[PDB]
Design a protein around this nucleic acid. Structure first.
Lengths: 135, 535
RNA sequence: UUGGCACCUCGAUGUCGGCUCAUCGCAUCCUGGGGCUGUAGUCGGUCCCAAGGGUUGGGCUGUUCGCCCAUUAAAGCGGUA
RNA sequence: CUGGGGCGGUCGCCUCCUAAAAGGUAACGGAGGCGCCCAAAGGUUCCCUCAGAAUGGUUGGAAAUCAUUCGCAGAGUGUAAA
RNA sequence: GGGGCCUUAGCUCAGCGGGAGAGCGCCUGCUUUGCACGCAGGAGGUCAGCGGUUCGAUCCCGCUAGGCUCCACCA
């Protein structure tokens, strides 16, 4: 469960997703990447689920260069409650996206292994993506 | 056990120490109270204890200690007792309550008098400041809340009580009321007199009618000469005030109780930790040795029964051979061992000749694997047995540093749990120096860390001992004979001469596993010995 | 179902459960017909096509639900204020 | 006041973000502060300038003080924020 | 229904990544005019389970499980 250990404000305004990825849209710390075609709000539990998936398919698989960090928190009020009475309480964390953004690079392991590992990684996920590699 | 010894002490210190304003009180050690008193108008020392082994009032040797952090116990002492005058040094009759009439021209000027009963009871004694006018405890040591059956309690609010004393005579005399044919008599001394311990009792039984000897040896106590000794008789160290009654051992004459118990016991006291450990480990190497010897003969006992493999294995081979005269639906067979017995086997109808042949091979390899597993288990077990015997081989020569060293060896064996301390050496009778491999690890340090290769080495040939080396000294006739001799009389076979130690170049000295080393390519030298040359 | 909004109804929309009458759906409870099986058979398990018909009687509790006894081939799950 | 009421919470003032680059803009939105303080913490004249880091070196010590170069600036600016 | 605490020795519990331990209790021998013992020890262990963590986990992470404990308005 990726975390920021320290925060300024426990809470935020929620945010939006328009446009496209500023940077990190291409594999250059690793060899064989995966990138977005969409965007959403994402959990460290999900990304580490993919981690364990790929690293068990590969069993130590190479090296990654993860591109992201779940900086954003989100709240979740208690249950069967009405509106108002102040903002809800912080619940977990969130990792945000823009399309064209790369999430995981890979290196040290064969391209075909990469393809299938990231297949099993991708099928976890709510989004549409594709494989990439370095220029 | 009772207070004739204690009352002699009481009188011989009452002669001395009366006339004392209590000056200082010192205790870091848990139950060793150091006092200074203005006794005989002198700043005069004293030691006290009620430790569950140690209790004595001791015009002592060099005192140990000054805490600068005394217990709140000692602060109650400095509160009530310090500045206290010794009116008198009295016995509560004869049982071991040594009364101390503590007057005090205290910080006021009032003459606050109290008792300080010390129930000197050896192991479980109790120094008790009993407020005399009220007979109330104001600070005590041993509890019995009365959470269970017995009688009295510490608490400094608890009113003081005397534990129930017993029908002691406090002295032919036996013939009037009793009989000395009552039975075994030392137990009955214990039952019946206040001149008691079971040992002091039986020694009195040997001091041999008898009650004249009793009251006249008390008259010797009244002479108050009693040249003390510690009779080391079979290690029993009877600290006994006239020279030994009986059992005829030693007599270590301490002219002073000052040195009698402290410098002896304190000399023992560290060693008494060493002997706690040594005797725990005595009982425990005894255990683990006999323990696993039992469990492994038990392994063998359970083992001998079943093989159930090659029977039906060879017949599975037979059916594989005669795999063209078979039905799946038979029990019996017809057989030749290429030998020709014609066994008619069981063959399990509704199951094929193949199926039952390879099932015979299955049970074959199965019993094979089970028994081979159990036999490598038992091989581990036998190497473990002689590993106990090897541990013991070294242990019979082990010193207390080797006790700790083998406690480390058994952390290594996983069996125990408690810095360069390699090994030691001795003066050979031939004016040389022989390195004494005194343990497994001490042998590693004396041979594998210290000694040189192609040297003269030696180990006790099947005797419980330690190893030795004339390291980088090619042991000649004299040197090799002297080294083999030191081994031959340092082993547990020290009575057996001709200890045939194999010596040669240490280059061939094997090493393995772990602790599995050997001295091979070596010619044996049979030796006997004396002892004191080693030093 | 538990819930959120406060949108019709406060110049009135009777609210639980039960009886009688029911009746629509079917992700089927039994019965029809299938394929898979780690389905020997017999019983089974899984999934599919299938709503034509059918899907008990009582003790406890106001109850519902649930429990219990004995059945049945089975004693379904929802809607309709 | 109240996303029915009730409990609870708040009720006035100030700083910020929400606030959509003039300004303004609500919610039982998000966050912090006040019911003061200095008679020198003022007015004026004159003066020089930091925060930390490195080096070195008593007690000095990781850390007092210290020279030492680095050093718009990391400190200070009575007080929250800006 | 939700929140908080907790599962380690037969009992009570600490330990809180690189060695599973204190005491109560059972067993072993010491010995004890308080029958009180104490002594030394010894055995006695799924650190509740699963998963991840790490080079390795009682310990770090998440989940589940339970046990406890606190709090849960009007039709």
């Amino acid at each position: 469960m990726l975390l920021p250990k320290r925060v300024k404000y426990r809470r935020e305004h929620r945010g939006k997703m328009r446009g496209r990825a500023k940077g990190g849209t291409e594999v250059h710390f690793g060899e064989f990447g995966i990138q977005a075609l969409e965007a959403s709000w994402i959990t460290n539990r999900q990304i580490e689920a993919a981690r364990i998936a790929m690293t068990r398919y590969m069993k130590r698989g190479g090296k990654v260069w993860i591109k992201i960090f779940p900086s954003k928190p989100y709240t979740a009020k208690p249950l069967e409650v009405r509106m108002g009475s102040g903002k809800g309480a912080p619940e977990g964390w969130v990792a945000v996206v823009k399309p064209g953004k790369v999430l995981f690079e890979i290196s040290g392991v064969s391209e075909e292994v990469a393809r299938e590992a990231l297949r099993l990684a991708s099928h976890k996920l709510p989004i549409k993506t594709k494989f990439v590699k370095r220029e | 056990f009772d207070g004739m010894f204690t009352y002699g002490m009481t009188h011989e210190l009452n002669e001395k120490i009366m006339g004392g304003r209590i000056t200082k009180i010192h205790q870091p050690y848990k139950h060793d109270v150091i006092f200074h008193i203005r006794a005989k108008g002198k700043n005069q020392k004293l030691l006290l204890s009620a430790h569950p082994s140690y209790s004595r009032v001791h015009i002592t040797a060099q005192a140990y200690e000054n805490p600068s952090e005394p217990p709140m116990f000692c602060m109650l002492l400095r509160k009530h007792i310090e500045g206290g005058f010794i009116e008198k040094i009295e016995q509560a009759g004869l049982d071991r309550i040594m009364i101390f009439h503590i007057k005090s021209r205290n910080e006021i000027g009032d003459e606050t008098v109290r008792k300080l009963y010390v129930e000197i009871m050896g192991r479980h004694s109790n120094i008790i400041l009993t407020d005399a006018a009220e007979n109330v405890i104001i600070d005590g040591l041993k509890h019995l809340s009365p959470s269970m059956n017995s009688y009295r309690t510490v608490l400094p609010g608890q009113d003081y009580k005397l534990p129930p004393a017993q029908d002691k005579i406090s002295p032919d005399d036996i013939l009037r009321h009793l009989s000395f044919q009552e039975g075994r008599l030392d137990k009955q001394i214990v039952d019946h007199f206040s001149g008691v311990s079971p040992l002091f009792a039986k020694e009195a039984v040997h001091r041999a009618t008898l009650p004249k000897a009793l009251l006249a040896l008390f008259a010797e106590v009244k002479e108050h000469r009693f040249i003390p000794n510690i009779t080391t008789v079979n290690g029993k160290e009877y600290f006994y005030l006239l020279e030994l009654t009986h059992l005829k051992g030693e007599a270590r004459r301490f002219d002073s109780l000052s040195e009698l118990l402290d410098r002896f016991y304190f000399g023992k006291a560290e060693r008494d930790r060493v002997k706690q450990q040594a005797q725990d480990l005595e009982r425990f190497v005894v255990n683990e040795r006999k323990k696993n010897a039992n469990k492994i003969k038990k392994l063998e006992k359970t083992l001998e029964y079943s093989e159930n493999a090659k029977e039906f294995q060879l017949y599975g081979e037979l059916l594989t051979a005669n795999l063209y005269m078979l039905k799946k639906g038979d029990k019996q067979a017809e057989v030749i061992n290429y030998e020709s017995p014609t066994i008619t086997i069981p063959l399990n109808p509704n199951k094929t000749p193949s199926e039952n042949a390879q099932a015979y091979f299955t049970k074959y390899q199965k019993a094979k694997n089970s028994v081979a597993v159990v036999e490598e288990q038992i091989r581990l077990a036998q190497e473990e047995i002689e590993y106990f015997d090897q541990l013991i081989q070294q242990l019979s020569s082990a010193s207390p540093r080797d006790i700790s060293e083998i406690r480390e060896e058994l952390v290594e064996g996983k069996y125990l749990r408690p810095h360069n301390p390699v090994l030691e050496t001795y003066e050979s009778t031939s004016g040389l120096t022989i390195l004494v491999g005194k343990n497994n690890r001490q042998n590693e340090y004396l041979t594998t860390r210290v000694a040189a290769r192609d040297d003269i080495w030696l180990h006790t040939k099947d005797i419980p001992g330690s190893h030795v080396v004339i390291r980088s000294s090619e042991p000649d006739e004299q040197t090799i004979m002297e080294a083999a001799t030191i081994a031959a009389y340092f082993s547990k076979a020290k009575d057996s001469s001709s200890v045939p130690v194999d010596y040669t170049k240490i280059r061939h000295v094997k090493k393995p596993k772990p602790g599995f080393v050997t001295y091979d390519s070596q010619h044996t030298v049979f030796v006997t010995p004396d002892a004191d040359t080693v030093i």
